[PDB]
């Protein structure tokens, strides 16, 4: 039977808004 | 007087404020840093995003094995939005 695991890369961002 | 403006929430924040942001079909945990630039730092690392939904650390959810049994999934986080699904 299948098992599946996920995660995220580039998960953290910085932006300027002013 | 120093603020960040987040167009995704449409709200204006003070320095040190935290909030949730909708973007890219996910929920981000954001902080108004300020830095004279309305600077915001946001992350999905402490949430799980699977099957189009957004989960918090410790949440569990069900989904059919794409078959044909159900999977139980859990949100672990582990600093990279980690989740795992196994047959129940």
User: CATH 2.10.70.10 spans which residues of chain B?
Assistant: 1-45, 46-88
- How many CB atoms neighbour CB A2 within 10 A? 11
Q: In this structure, are residues B53 and B44 in contact, taking their beta carbons and an 8 Å threshold?
A: no
Q: How far is CA B29 from the centre of its chain?
A: 6
* Chain A residues lying within 8 Å of B69, measured CB to CB: 1
Q: Are residues A3 and B33, on separate chains, in Cβ contact within 8 Å?
A: no
Report the residue from B40, B49, B65 with minimal CB separation from A15. Answer: B40
* Chain A residues lying within 8 Å of B35, measured CB to CB: 16
Range list of β-strands (E), chain B: 3-6, 11-14, 18-23, 26-34, 39-43, 47-50, 53-56, 60-64, 70-77, 82-87
Enter the tokens of residue B4: 């960040």
Q: In this structure, are residues B3 and A18 in contact, taking their beta carbons and an 8 Å threshold?
A: yes
Domain B46-88 has CATH 2.10.70.10: yes
Q: What is the resolution of this structure in A?
A: 1.7
Q: How was this structure determined?
A: X-ray
Strand partners, B21: B28
Enter the tokens of residue B3: 């603020």
Q: What is the distance in angstroms between the CA of the first residue and the CA of the last residue of chain B?
A: 53
Interchain contact A10–B (C-beta under 8 A) = no
Q: In this structure, are residues B76 and B48 in contact, taking their beta carbons and an 8 Å threshold?
A: yes
Q: In this structure, are residues B88 and B77 in contact, taking their beta carbons and an 8 Å threshold?
A: no
Rounded CA gap, B42 and B13, in Å?
A: 14
CA–CA min distance A10, chain B (Å):
9
User: Candidates 2.130.10.10, 3.50.50.60, 1.10.287.3610, 2.10.70.10; correct CATH number of B1-45?
Assistant: 2.10.70.10
DSSP reduced 3-state for B65: coil
Contacts of B83 (CB under 8 A, 6+ apart): A5, A6, A7, B48, B50, B55, B73, B74, B75, B76
- How many CB atoms neighbour CB B38 within 10 A? 19
């Amino acid at each position: 039977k299948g098992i599946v695991t996920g995660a995220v890369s580039d998960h953290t961002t910085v932006e300027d808004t002013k | 007087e120093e603020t960040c403006f987040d167009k995704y929430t449409g709200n204006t924040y003070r320095v040190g404020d935290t909030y949730e942001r909708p973007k890219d079909s996910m929920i981000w945990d954001c902080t108004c840093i300020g830095a004279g630039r309305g600077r915001i730092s946001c992350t999905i690392a402490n949430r799980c995003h699977e099957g189009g939904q957004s989960y918090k650390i410790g949440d569990t959810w069900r989904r059919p094995h794409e078959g044909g049994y159900m999977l139980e999934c859990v949100c672990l986080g582990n600093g990279k939005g980690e989740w795992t699904c196994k047959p129940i």
